[PDB]
Design a protein around this ligand. Structure first.
Ligand SMILES: NC(=O)c1ccc[n+]([C@@H]2O[C@H](COP(=O)([O-])OP(=O)(O)OC[C@H]3O[C@@H](n4cnc5c(N)ncnc54)[C@H](O)[C@@H]3O)[C@@H](O)[C@H]2O)c1
Ligand SMILES: NC(=O)c1ccc[n+]([C@@H]2O[C@H](COP(=O)([O-])OP(=O)(O)OC[C@H]3O[C@@H](n4cnc5c(N)ncnc54)[C@H](O)[C@@H]3O)[C@@H](O)[C@H]2O)c1
Ligand SMILES: NC(=O)c1ccc[n+]([C@@H]2O[C@H](COP(=O)([O-])OP(=O)(O)OC[C@H]3O[C@@H](n4cnc5c(N)ncnc54)[C@H](O)[C@@H]3O)[C@@H](O)[C@H]2O)c1
Ligand SMILES: NC(=O)c1ccc[n+]([C@@H]2O[C@H](COP(=O)([O-])OP(=O)(O)OC[C@H]3O[C@@H](n4cnc5c(N)ncnc54)[C@H](O)[C@@H]3O)[C@@H](O)[C@H]2O)c1
Ligand SMILES: O=c1[nH]c(CC2CCCCC2)cc(O)c1-c1ccccc1
Ligand SMILES: O=c1[nH]c(CC2CCCCC2)cc(O)c1-c1ccccc1
Ligand SMILES: O=c1[nH]c(CC2CCCCC2)cc(O)c1-c1ccccc1
Ligand SMILES: O=c1[nH]c(CC2CCCCC2)cc(O)c1-c1ccccc1
Lengths: 267, 267, 267, 267
């Protein structure tokens, strides 16, 4: 197994279609002892997380909560037993109000909405890193989830911007985590049909967008030289796991692209 | 004259060292009729703007003010006389609290600061464009000011993040301005010794940073194949003008690099 | 005029659909005294260049010809009269054998074809700079023609690579040119329907590719936030002029994009 | 083992300081059955390759040799037993005449030298792919060796350009290899002190550059958030192996950076 005896925090599970859930599963299948966090809906997360091939402690973590954040390292230490440190952390957290995505015009997103988006989507990356870097072993690795925001695109809107922040934050976090012998990197994933993502494809965030969501998806698989299955979250998790392994030991401040190579091709 | 009879909004003047000042001057020398906005210190700005080779209306513009924002278009219309439109707008606005720059550690910037920074430095770019696109002529052209945030650097901290956001916002603004026959572009400039930038090199934002500011600055000129004078904001202003001109007519959502070629060179 | 009393070398006219032909025209309209070079078909070029709004000398220039290259500066000096130096040079040259574009498979282009393509398409760019830097005024500007090769694409094949070479060559030329107070830059244009580009859309380089050429071209205009007319070379020429002007004075080793903002958008 | 019972071709061993050697060793420790190719000095490679923890067939491969190329897949077949297919191919081949590197002036490299360089350094990558794609299993992965050429630099010269070709060639190969279920990617490695690399630091390619090599190297480690050890080729090799594994299954046409994070940092 590729993650034997590595202790790993994983945030961002909410359904079994979450990228994070699939990250968790693969992690465990490679021998990792996990520590999970979730947000708001503890009663639901707990029951979802029982499906993972292995029981793992779940802790509450709103990243907008200065307390949850302050207490964090303590409660992680309590969950894994003192004298022990984390080998890897998974940021797979993201949020944007519907005023900043879909058919709803770019200009009409009020800053209170966007800001919160960025707080959760981008800032929390450093917040998590700040809380956990104290309890991280040399060799350790933080990873977060990204969607390629170099070129603008329809619908994705302010969420594109948050991701633009996030890649740049990532780079500063690699400066700090560096000091503890810890890598930080992002995984730029092609689209994944989460429950969330399947709603948008039934009417949720509008009508003009829901066609542009499917158009995006289809064009992804067309540009990807090896192809892209939005219904399979595994190759993204496997990539994540390889950044949590000891096998990319010279890679920090960076973005790995698990996208079937689609960003590398124009048509 | 390169900007004959083009009417152009210019924001971001506060001293005669402001890049925006230098932009306005060169714009006028080129036959542009200007409209100026300032923030907070109107009594000071007004008396600074008398040094420009031509009197030009001065309006109040705090970009965190929903009112100032809503009323802008009309007060501009009033400023230049109805039946006339702007041909060009200059975002040259930016801010970040000293918890998010200089010696002060990256992780110790609380979110209320960082957000405020991004609101002024980045969100405002779309705020402004939303307010001004209605009153902009076909062939029109927006510009914002940029510092190259693709690599992380010491000191520049959360400002870098703000800048990565901005670049991304630019590209969305391009989508919108497009619909009006209007180009959107950024000028990523080398460092310019403003009053603020002389204070940082006198003690302001720490001691460790003040040598890294001078180490950044010296490295810029070294890496620049034509050289870089941080004392001279003219070439930066000239570049902005040429985006305001009619001569880069197929350029939008972009960043032009006024940095003496330093980002194209490693050593 | 924008190029008043600037003397300027232009290469790569062969027809009045040549980007370089349009470059020439716009340059003269702006007041530039030109010096042209042509390849192989001098009798045809001469007669084509009689359509420009001004008579300008014509020189023979094969860029694979070491002699033509060694003698160049001298014949340029003789054309523009001794004691006078060029203020600007335009590379608008490029060539790739059909085994290295269109429907013909990527793997089947033998190296002697690929090499020649790079010789003309990429190496010459420095071969030209090497010849002409000696006789270039401080403040002077070189420019070459580019098509954005950062992502792969169907058909464009080994030309794509020749472009990647040329981008990188550009950045070194910037090092040398800088020693003379001379900028070097590239204009990454969208597709232009030259005579050569209309033949590919008639049947020239296959049948599969010709559909992908039209599909590329159509996607371009669709992606372009201000739009893209592949029948009008003008904006590309204007942009070139702006790099030959005094107005982008701190720009070197770079690529400006005259593509209607299409590379900044995914969909 | 990470590469259990995977069959892998590895090119570019010439000394035990060769990255390729280090690539071979770690691949075997992971359970890969290797097939090696060498150039020109077969008697010396054979005896150097006896040091690898496992005996492996050695074949002759000059990539400038149309025959060697044509006969390749067959001889490989013959080396591993018919009915069997490669799961991996390592391009770790590079060359450039001293007229195109070091203190020797950029402009003085004649095109016969440059072209050879590109032939070996760049074109060959697709040559190899053309030869072996016929005999590669679905799931298979090609990898080549890169030095980040996005910004120019001193000494590195025409090799830089070759690399710029290679990254572009890479992307097209991904197109072709895609059709076989095969991934193509490059690894952008920091500097490795090979034997060749210690010569240059003794006197070989000049005096001015021999300081610029050591200046480059020192800056690399300075810039690297987790640091960079030019005397240890291991982490490079491990990264290579990770791309040869099944753990980056959605990654093609790309560059992974094994450079300690130095290209994501400015200072
Ligand atoms: N699904 C895709 O197509 C795709 C592609 C690339 C990147 N990503 C990224 O993956 C990450 C998650 O994607 P997903 O598809 O699994 O969505 P998801 O809803 O399954 O996961 C997002 C998580 O954000 C959490 N969250 C929201 N507000 C929070 C707060 N204040 N504090 C802490 N957590 C909070 C939710 O609990 C949820 O678990 C996001 O960053 C997204 O940008 C997704
Ligand atoms: N100085 C540099 O080295 C450098 C280099 C590249 C880019 N830039 C960018 O150019 C712009 C200005 O640079 P400068 O050196 O002229 O600095 P400056 O301080 O002269 O300009 C910043 C301006 O921001 C304005 N401002 C602050 N808060 C505001 C608000 N709420 N609403 C409206 N305006 C507000 C001030 O009035 C001021 O004129 C910034 O965007 C900056 O990031 C600066
Ligand atoms: N047409 C497009 O869509 C497009 C798009 C982007 C960039 N470009 C670039 O613009 C440039 C010219 O494009 P174009 O559409 O005008 O094609 P064109 O055929 O009109 O111009 C190319 C020139 O190459 C010249 N040439 C060929 N071999 C030569 C040699 N050995 N020595 C000197 N000159 C030689 C020809 O005389 C010709 O004028 C090329 O560099 C091309 O890559 C073209
Ligand atoms: N050492 C570094 O600092 C460094 C950094 C980044 C990338 N790289 C890359 O790694 C690869 C090898 O680097 P290295 O330092 O191990 O050098 P090396 O000399 O040990 O490997 C280069 C190989 O090229 C081979 N070769 C030359 N001409 C050939 C031909 N016609 N056909 C087949 N093989 C031929 C040589 O036999 C040699 O084994 C190259 O791609 C190089 O660009 C090296
Ligand atoms: O659902 C997403 N999907 C995508 C990719 C989508 C959006 C663009 C159009 C289709 C693909 C990115 C992304 O960041 C998310 C996301 C947003 C908020 C919270 C969790 C996940
Ligand atoms: O003064 C600046 N200077 C720089 C360049 C300096 C500072 C970072 C490190 C040295 C170079 C960038 C920048 O965004 C600013 C800036 C900050 C606040 C408001 C407006 C502009
Ligand atoms: O004609 C071209 N056209 C384009 C743009 C076209 C080709 C790619 C697909 C559609 C756009 C690029 C290009 O490099 C060329 C070109 C080819 C030979 C010589 C000089 C220039
Ligand atoms: O030796 C190299 N060294 C480097 C990195 C060096 C060169 C630039 C300055 C110091 C780092 C790259 C590279 O491709 C090579 C190389 C070139 C040809 C054959 C084998 C190896």
């Amino acid at each position: 197994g590729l993650l034997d005896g590595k202790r790993i925090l994983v945030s961002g599970i909410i359904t079994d279609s979450s990228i994070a859930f699939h990250i968790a599963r693969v992690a465990q299948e490679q021998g990792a002892q996990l520590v999970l966090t979730g947000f708001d809906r503890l009663r639901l997360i707990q029951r979802i997380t029982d499906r993972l091939p292995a029981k793992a402690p779940l802790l509450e973590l709103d990243v907008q909560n200065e307390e949850h954040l302050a207490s964090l390292a303590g409660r992680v230490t309590e969950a894994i037993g003192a004298g022990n440190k984390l080998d890897g952390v998974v940021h797979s957290i993201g949020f944007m109000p519907q005023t900043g995505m879909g058919i709803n015009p770019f200009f009409d997103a009020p800053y209170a909405d966007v800001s919160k988006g960025i707080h959760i989507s981008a800032y929390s990356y450093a917040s998590m890193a700040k809380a956990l870097l104290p309890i991280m072993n040399p060799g350790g690795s933080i990873v977060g989830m990204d969607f390629d925001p170099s070129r603008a695109m329809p619908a994705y809107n302010w969420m594109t911007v948050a991701k633009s922040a996030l890649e740049s934050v990532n780079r500063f976090v690699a400066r700090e985590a560096g000091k503890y012998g810890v890598r930080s990197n992002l995984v730029a994933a092609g689209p994944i049909r989460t429950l969330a993502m399947s709603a948008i494809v039934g009417g949720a965030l509008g009508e003009e967008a829901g066609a542009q969501i499917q158009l995006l998806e289809e064009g992804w698989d067309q540009r990807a030289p090896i192809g892209w299955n939005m219904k399979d979250a595994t190759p993204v998790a496997k990539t994540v796991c390889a950044l949590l392994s000891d096998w990319l030991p010279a890679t920090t401040g960076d973005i790995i692209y698990a996208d079937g190579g689609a960003h590398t091709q124009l048509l």
